[model samples]
Each structure stands twice: as C-alpha cells, then as structure tokens.
Target: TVTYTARVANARFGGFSQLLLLWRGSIYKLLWRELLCFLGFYMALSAAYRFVLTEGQKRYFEKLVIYCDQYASLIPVSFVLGFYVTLVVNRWWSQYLCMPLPDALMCVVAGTVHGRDDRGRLYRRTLMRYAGLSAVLILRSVSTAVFKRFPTIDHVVEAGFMTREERKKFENLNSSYNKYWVPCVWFSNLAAQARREGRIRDNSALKLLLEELNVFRGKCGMLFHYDWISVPLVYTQVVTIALYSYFLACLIGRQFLDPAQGYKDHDLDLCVPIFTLLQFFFYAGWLKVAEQLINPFGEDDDDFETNFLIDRNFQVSMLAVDEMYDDLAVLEKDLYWDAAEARAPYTAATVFQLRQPSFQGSTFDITLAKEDMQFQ
Candidate 1:
C-alpha cells in the first residue's frame, strides 16, 4: 500500500505540459531541420536584395514585393490544409493495405491433405503454387518488384510458377483487363482434381480449402483496389491549388524592400523572415509529409519487398506442404497431466510480473459480517 500510494503520488503528472516541450515527435522537433533549410533560402534571397542587387533592381523588386502582400490576407490556409491532411494522412495507415500474407492460406492447404507419397507431394505442392502464382500476378502490375523481376508472364513461366501450358489457358480466358484472378480460378479447378482422386480426407475438407482459398484471393483483389483509389486526381489538384496559391502570397508579402513607398526598415529587417519562415513551416507541413506518404510502397529500401515475399512463400511452401504435413510427434502425457489446476512455472526474473494479488476479484476485499457465515 505504501509503495503503490507513493508511486501514484510521484506520478502527480505534469506530462500534459511536459509533452509540449519534450521534442521527441513534436512539430518543434523534426520541423526545425527542415525549417532550417527553408530559412536559408529566404535568407539568401533577402541578402541578394540588401547587398547584391543594384538600386535600379532594388526599386524594381520592392514594387513587386508590395504588390504580392496585397493578396496575402486573402488565401484560405485552413480550406486546403485541414481537408488536405484529412485525406492524406488517413491513407498512411493503409501501409497495412495491399499487403499480401500467406500464413492462413498455407495452414489450411498443408493440414487438409493427407498425402505422403510422390503423388501426395505433387498435388499438395501444386495447390499452393497456384496460389503463389496468383499473388505474383496481382502484385506485378501494382508493385515495384514485379517489373524489376518478372518483366512479363514470360519469366513467371521461366521461374516455374506458371507452366508453359498454363500460359495458353491464361491468354485463352481473353476478357479481364487484369488476369490475376484467373490463377485463383485455376486453383479452384485443381481442388476438384484432389476430390476425384480421393486425396483430401472428408468432402468438407476440400470445401474448407476452397473457402479459405477465396479469402486469400479476395485480399489479393483488395490489394489492388484501395491501391487503385489512391488519392484521387481531383483531391491532389485541389490541395495543390491551395498550397500553390498560398505560396504565391508568401513569396510577395514577407519581402523587405530598400526603397518602398511606406514600408519601414530600409535596411531590410532580419525580423520579418522569422514569421515568414514560420508560415513556410505550416504550409510545408501539409506539403512534404503528404508527398512522401502518398505512395508508401514506392519507398524501395523501406517497407515491403514483393520479390522476397514470393520467394519466401514458395520455398517455404515446399517445406511446409511436404515435410511439415503429417509430422506431429507421437502422443505423450503433458507434464501436468495429474493436476486439475495447471500452473505454468515462472522464472525468477518474470515472477514479480505474475502478481497473485492482481487476480483477486473486486468483491474479494469486502468485509462481511461474521454472523452472515454462521447463520445462527
């Protein structure tokens, strides 16, 4: 009680205010280096006005500067900024989207088949190959690694995911603007091959394989979908209009002229730039962050690698469906077989984390009358 009370009291938190100045992820943190660069450009431009340009050009540039400030107050920073980020940052979370995963699809395929021979290995291996081939087809048109490696279906056949004869059936289908789902169609056809051969254990076992088969196929199509809808041309143009026009106001309003009509500080004040540079930070906040994040998959050295994913799923597919199938160890009693309430042993370091008192119910501490239990 003493330690818990003291710990809670110590946390009598100033974090609400502290978080503002903490500088870890705060705008005041990463913004400074980028802000530093923008300031340098404007500073040099101002210096050229003060020191480099002749008085004839100085008087000329000053009139242009005053003209720009006239429209500075008119541009709506919030109209484009607030709506722009609402759509832009929202898509960054979709780095999770279009991502292909094979674990669940592989699990059902590996477990459903009971084959142990060359015939068994062949069908089971081919079942997953069709799936891998479909995933590669879907990703090729949409992702970076596709063109870099596959180049076209020619290499997919050469790589052995698509058979030489499989290429004929693919072109033969003839109608899809995108033909990736045809591989899944072929996957569905081959499941019946196992059904007629009587390889899968129960009728529903084959049904489970195809049912889960559609789930991976649906996810592959969805991978191409939200990817297709990636920030609409209309929205990109709208935000660019707002930011580009606001930048026009910034270029004019913040300048200092040597011989302006009523402007002060003929020496071209250093102080004018801080706020000008400050506004640059705000406008750039909506610009640069959205620029890089719009297509997260385009980032090569970072995030996803589709080529590596295809290889991993295929090689591991052979290992999983071949050796990992039907390989459970012989049944043996668990170490706690005799105990009705099993206790997993706790190590010395982690034992403190397993607090027995934490599990006691809310009512466990209630003080009941002694006579209630007696019922005398």
Candidate 2:
C-alpha cells in the first residue's frame, strides 16, 4: 500500500496540457475555413444562449438540469424530424454544390500553397491535418446540436462497464469488431497475384486468409444489426442520464446529510466543466458515427479533407520521385562524362596516353591501367 501510494504521488503526466496543445496547433494551421467555421458556430450558439436566452450568468454547467427533466427530453424529437433536411442538403451538395464551387476552390488553393518545395516536415503536416479534424469535430457537434436535437449519450456507458456480461453482445454488433474481413479478402487477392508472378510456389498466406474470411462472414448479421425506430437512438442517452441523475441525487443527499456517503468532488465548477466536456464529447461523438457510415472518399474517414490529404500525399510521393530522378540523372551524367584521370564511373579505358613511358604498371589491368594511360 505504501509503495503504491508513493508511485501514484510521484507520477508526473505529460508536461503539455491537452487544451494547450489543441489551441496552439489549431491556431497555427492558417486554415481560414476551419477557423471561421469553428469560431462562428461556437460563438453563435453561445451568443444565442447569452443574449437571446439571457442565460449567460447561469453558469453553463447548471443549465444541464434542463436536459435532465422529462419535458426537456422531448426536445430531441424535433431533431428526428430534421433528419430529412440533412439528407436533402447532403444529397444536393453531393449532386451539385461540391463540383464547381468547393472543388474548384480547393484545386486552386491546393496548387498554390502546397506545391512549393518549402513544405513543412511530415510530423508538422500530420499535426495540421489533425487540427483540421478537431475543428471539424467541434463544428459538426455544434451543427448537429442545432439540427439533430438529441440528448447526449454517455461514452463510458458505451464502454460496457456496468454491463460487462453483455459486452460480447454489443461487441458482436459493432462493425469495428468485424473490420478484419476486408483485410482477409484483400490478402487473398494479393496471394493469387503472387502465385501468378512465380515469386512464391506456396499459397500459405492464402489458406489462412480464407479461414479468416469464414470467421468474418459469420459476424455480418450480429455486427450490422439495426433497430427499427421512428425516433433516433439518442433517446437512450437521455433516458440513461435522467435515471442516473435521480440515483445520484439520492446518493449525494445521503452522502452530505447522512455523513456516510462516499466522499467525492461535487464542486459545481469541477463537475460542470467535466459534464460540459462529456456533453461536448456526446454531442460531437456523432461526427465519428456519421463519418463511419458516410466515408465516401477512399480515405475511410467521414470528414477527411480529401483534397488536402491528396495534395499532401501527392506532394510527398512526388518529392520522393523527384529526389530519385535527380540522383539518377546526376549519376548517369557522371557515369559517361568525358574526363581527365577518372575516379569510378569507367568500366573501360581510353587509349589517350598509350605511348607514355613514365607510367609504370601493366596497362592490361583495368584499375591501374587507367592510372597508366594519362593524357597530358
């Protein structure tokens, strides 16, 4: 116990904070659309709460009480109604809005800012991509709340803590759990190609790949199962919170008044930020859900900035190609260039100084023959 306590006390986490890292890197990207969208949406929602609702002084954490009420839980029904609107918007954008406007702008932007040799290193570029993702996550959360009207789901609840026994049930139902199938099919194709190439006489990898394919095919029904409901699945979260809040109220009252309740951090400041973080996580969580279902681009990410990723990936690939091309060009030129006493590129020698007598070695030997054959 003493040793464990000491270890816990001595542990110092990472020096930089998550918020600090997120903020600094986010500001540095110079992506005006992401910055403007995030800032605009966040402030717009905040302003509506502050000015129109006149709830600025209420301390944001306390406002979640509204969500806890039974009547307030009904507010999310409006969101279900708006689902068609979102579908229409998405369909229209896919059909028309994306081609001439956003795609063209992206083409111009990608050509100018990214094509230079002065590109940032790989690590910084990855950070820039993630910063864009973070902005997208934030904006989508706000927009979803505005449009999707639903109670926040508990991520921890999804983690299968209390219902560990039921873990396998949901795990079997999750597409991520069955994601191995796609790879199996891919490897089988690869093995067939290898056999055709005569590189490997055995198809050992292919046999294992088929066995894996059978396993994945079994998970199809369980993982991809759906619940038919007119209401969105978000209602589950509201119900969870409402019931849990009532339980906590009783537990907390017993703790304070009874002097027997387990001690915990019930400070409104701490709890609110934590709750807000949870709500933000809950609200924004659907971005991932949306992304999984709607990963149209080959990137396998819903909100992946395909234009930017392609630009960055192409730039990297081209740089590698250019470097190899330059090195080969220089190598080939140096290989055959006419020169004085040569260093290494010559396999055969010229008869420039065949009659020179001062040079002492057998001219028959190629290596030293080059030294013997000197041009004055």
Candidate 3:
C-alpha cells in the first residue's frame, strides 16, 4: 500500500516524472505494476470462487484455498520476471539501445517533414541533419518493432476500440517490428555504404550532420514503442471485452433461450470452471489495486512522493548550475561568507558530508565585518 509520503508524491506530480526516478533508482515500477495486476487477478478469483461454489462444493474447493495455491504460483513468476527485468532487460537495453533511440526519433520527425520535400535551399543542410536523424530513428523503431510481439485479442478488448481482426493485424505488425528486421537492414554494410557513399556522401548538408546514426537509432525503442510490456494486459482486456460481449448475449438470452431441466446440470458443471477462471482473473486484478504503494516512486501511485521528486530535481538542476565553484576550498565558505547570508543551505547539509551541525545555538547574529575577509 502507498504510504502518506507516496500518496503525497503521486497527488502532486505526474507519473512520468516519478517513473524516471523509479527507473533510475532501480525501484522496479514495472514489477510493481505487474504485482498490482496479480492482485487484481487474485481479487477476481476470490469473488468468483465465493459466488459459484455451494456450501458442499465449497468444502472440496476449500473455500478458495486451492486458488491461494494458484496465486502462490505467481510468486515464482514474479520473482523471475522482476529479477530479469532489473538485471537483464534493463542492462541490455541501456547498453544496446536506450541511449540513442531518443535522437533517432527527433531526427525522424525532423527529416520526414523536410527531406522528402525540398532538396536545395539555404536551410537544406540543416533540414538534412534532421532528415538523417529521423531516418536513423525510423529504422531503429522498425528494428525494435520487428522483434516485438503484440498482445493477442482473445476475448478481451483494450486496443483503442479496434475490431478483433484489426487488433490482430496490429499485433502482427507490432510483432514484425519487434523481431529486429529494421535494425538488421539499417546496420548491414550495404545499407551503411549506400547511405554514406551515394546520395549520403554527395550531399554536403548531409555530411555536415553532427549526430551519429547508431546513437539516434538506439533511442528509437524508448521513443516509438514505450508500452511493449503492457501488450499482454491490453490483449487480456480485449479478451475481457469479448467475454463481456459474450456475457451480454448470455444475459439477454436467459429470458428467451432457457435450457431444459436436463441441460441445467451440465451448465452448472461447465460454469464451475468458467466461474473459477473469471475468479482467477479478478483475483489477479485485486493484487494490483495498490501497485503504487509498493513502488510509491512511480507517478501513477496515489501516494507518490512529489516533494522528494521536486527536491531530487532541484538537486539535479543544481549539479551543474552556478551554485558551485571549481576550487575545493571555496566550496564551504561561499554560501556563508556574507554578513546577511541565510545559512539555511549550510544548516541542511547532509550529515554524511559533515557530521557536526553548522549552527551553534538556537540564536545567532546576522552581522559580519567584511574587513576581516581576506578577499575584500
């Protein structure tokens, strides 16, 4: 559950800012979200189990006890995925892809607007850089998208109201992109040589481009396909919607298409598993209800730490700001040197940096004699 601090953070700032911090801090926001999803599944399962089984059947079902075992199975899955995401996936992405993909996207947006239209002008060179960058970005996106697999639209419906077939096609397209075809094509010697030696080299403006193609290429993954992991959940939702549609049909049919008495027993038996399945689904959802709580650093959490986020940003903003001087000796005295200087910064110094407090007593004078200062 999100604590007071977490709630405070989320309520004030957006989730994306917090997501950056969480990603930086190695807080596993992804896993946190997944855990919340599991909770949702657990809750749904519990309710369905409770609703469907009669008192006598409840004994065999152990009143959802076995479902608890099923829930327990999620533990290993979560652990493996959590560890994989942190240690493996993140590490891989940071190294092979994360850094440059951003530039690529920027280049693509710039190039598509300029390069495909005009070839020569005073701004032609400038436009070409954007065009080149954009090309790099597009290729990168195509690469990542090739290797990717999108969520299947079973009975659930989460993809932007797309029909089942449309969603499937989109997923397939997504899968092709993720499989890395674009990267392979872009990185091949023929592609590189063609770009560099032919029109790429001939164009003086293109030659003037500053950014590296690979660097921009790497950033495309982060830019073009951010919500890759959520594909499954999205597909599940699509399935849920379909199931809902099926349910609506059933609900409406109950009045007109009532089964005979003999078929009722069979229906009850089939319902047992469906009841179990739906319950499991909801149970998964319940676990995720307090997702932000576990990873309060995430922006989406109700209990996110906005103050901390802002404070951290201030720290980052100040890192290369005008606050610090080059010389080591000047560090300490710069802030407190003046007669009217507010010593708040000195007072709040982290204990690790300086164990003793700067302030002597509760009270202190603001006056100083500048004549005593050597620099003066």
Candidate 4:
C-alpha cells in the first residue's frame, strides 16, 4: 500500500540508496522522534560530564559508567529482539493473508445464481453483501481505523452495508461473543433459500456457493483470532525492558570519559559519541520495526490500510456480481490463431521481456560425463 517501487527499482550501484530518500512510510519517519530524543539526552549527559562535573565526581562517574557498560552487554538484546521481530513479522503477514477477499465468493454468486431479472440480481448482490458485511463486522472489531469510521451498527447501516431490518435481527440475536459470524449464517440460509427457489441452478451449485462462503468466513474468523490472541503481554514486556534498559545503561555507560584518567576504551574523549549514537540507531530502529509490525490494524504509516481494503472489497465484489455479471467481450480470431505456437504480442514497453528465456530447471544446462553417467 505504501509504494516505493520506483525508487527501489532505481537502486542499482547501492541498494536502498534511492529508498533511503523516501520520507513516507520510511524507517526515518518512524524513528526520527526517538532518535532526536536520544541524541538530546546523550548530548546533555556529555555536556554535564565535560563542563559541570568536579574532578572527584568525574572519577566516580567514570567508574559507574564502566560498571554499567559491563552489565549492559549481558542484556541478551540481540537474541530477544531477533525472536520477537520474527514473531511480529510472521503475524503481520498472516493477518494480511487472512483479510477476507470476496472475489471467489462473488464469482460463484454471479455464475451459479441464474436469471437476469430483478430477483436473480437481488440474490447475487445480497449474497455478496452478506460476505462483505461479515468482513466489515470483523474488521471493525479488530482495526482502529475501520472502527473509527463505522463506530456503531447504526453507522454500518447508514453506509448501506446493512438495512434497518437486518440491523434489528442482528441486535436481537443475544450472544456473549462477537457476532461477526452471524452474517455468514445469514449467507448460508439465504443461499439455501435461493437453492429452494431454483434461482441457484442446482444442488451442486448451491454446495459450491456454501463451500466458498465457508472459506470466506474461515478467513474472517482467522482475522478475529489474530486480533483476540495477540503476542503475549509478557513477551512484549521482556523485549521492551531489554531495549529501554540497554539504552538507559547507554546514557551513563556510552558517555565519553575524561582522557587523563585513561580508562580502557575511554582514551579519547571525542565529545560527539558518534558510535554510541549509531548503536542506538541500529538497536532502537530494530525495536521500532517490531513496534510498527506488532499491531498492524492501527493507523501507523506502515500498518494495513484497512479502510481502503474494505472499500475496495465492497466495490469490486458488487461490480463483479452486478455490473460485470455475464458480461464478456466478443469472441474473435487472434493474430496467432493459425499458428501452432501461439505467442501473444508484447507492447513496446514490454518487448524487451521477450529476450529472457523461461527457466526450465536447475539441471537443464548440465552435461553428463560418460564415466559419471555409467554409475548413475
């Protein structure tokens, strides 16, 4: 959704050189505030050490810094961060995969539910609406942006996602749990009714419809499960503690000590602390990546644009089932109709693609030696 493909593709001599310049949804956008705050404190501490502290106080501070440095190395930040970020990235991708797309369901609804009249169109549109409604219901519960847009059932009804009658029935169903699955139930019942009325061509077609509906519903349920069972609070706590504690230690430990004292690595008191700043950038940036990916349903720059997705799904599903139903271009003979090997013509933009041969297999170019072939 946050596209940087043009810049990414232009990066040749040095990868991410072009990408780094991008501000929107970039790491810089996410990390700038934290980086500045860290630098401010780091500079403050450096100033205090250089201009404010007395000789004896400087000596004590150096010792404390050395002690903090020794212990900061023992935090196991790399190990915990690697595992935590991996878990978050996996969950983030899985949530995107589980977002219910109505393409397959809409296709079935458009094809199987026969008749060109108002009744048939109504059945097809209504079926798709139910599927889309279920997704919206689940998304509202999970995603902050979606919930903000449709805060209540009245909002949903106002958006033409549901009707007044349907809203009444939805509220009347007394259940302790989320009723996202209710629309799916309605979909199955409606499909059954369509089957009874012969609107759905036959029992096989009805079975197919129900099967696709369940698959759609299953994805909806998976999204719900992901929202319900988030990364454990203790796990998040452990990672956060490791990162902040390391940086807190860095405040004292990473400061440049007095050169006259001649501490092991503190021989040169270069006021800037450049290497320490870089370390903060790397470690804190890693943690920030996990933070953005942890709950992708939020309104973060890199987070899932759930509202756009919802709008796209509804619009496309309705288009497929209604406007585009049974609509096809006229069949005509192609340029390659007489040729045995039918290859479609490429445009001027894509003509260069013809030079690249299809990959057959890894062993396609391998030549067998006579001696080796005899044994094998």
Best by TM-score: 4
Q: What TM-score goes with each of the models? A: 0.75, 0.20, 0.27, 0.92
Candidate number with greatest lDDT:
4
lDDT of 3 by residue, 28-86 (tens): 44345644554455445445545765666645544234333333333443443344334
| Model 3 alpha-carbon drift over 4 Å, by segment | 1-55, 63-75, 87-376
**Candidate 4: which pairs clash?**
none
* Candidate 4, superposed: residue stretches over 4 Å from native: 347-376
lDDT tens digits, residues 204-268, model 4?
99999999999999999999999989899999999999988889898889888878887888798
Q: Write the per-residue lDDT of candidate 1 for residues 38-133, one digit (tens) a residue.
A: 667566767887899887887787877777777765357666667777666676666455466667767887887768888888888888888898
Q: Give the backbone clash total of model 4.
A: 0
Candidate 1 residue-wise lDDT at 81:
66
RMSD of 2: 24.6
Q: List candidate 1 segments past 4 Å from native.
A: 1-44, 52-79, 256-268, 271-286, 300-303, 359-376
Worst 10-residue lDDT window, candidate 4:
2-11
Whole-model Cα lDDT of every candidate shown, in order: 0.73, 0.33, 0.37, 0.89
Q: Model 3's lDDT to the true fold?
A: 0.37
Candidate 4 structure, TM-score to reference:
0.92
The sequence of per-residue lDDT tens digits that candidate 2 reaches over residues 201-267 is 4455334434433443332222222111222446445534553343333222221111122223333
User: What overall lDDT, based on C-alpha atoms, would model 1 receive against the true structure?
Assistant: 0.73
Better of 1 and 3 by lDDT: 1
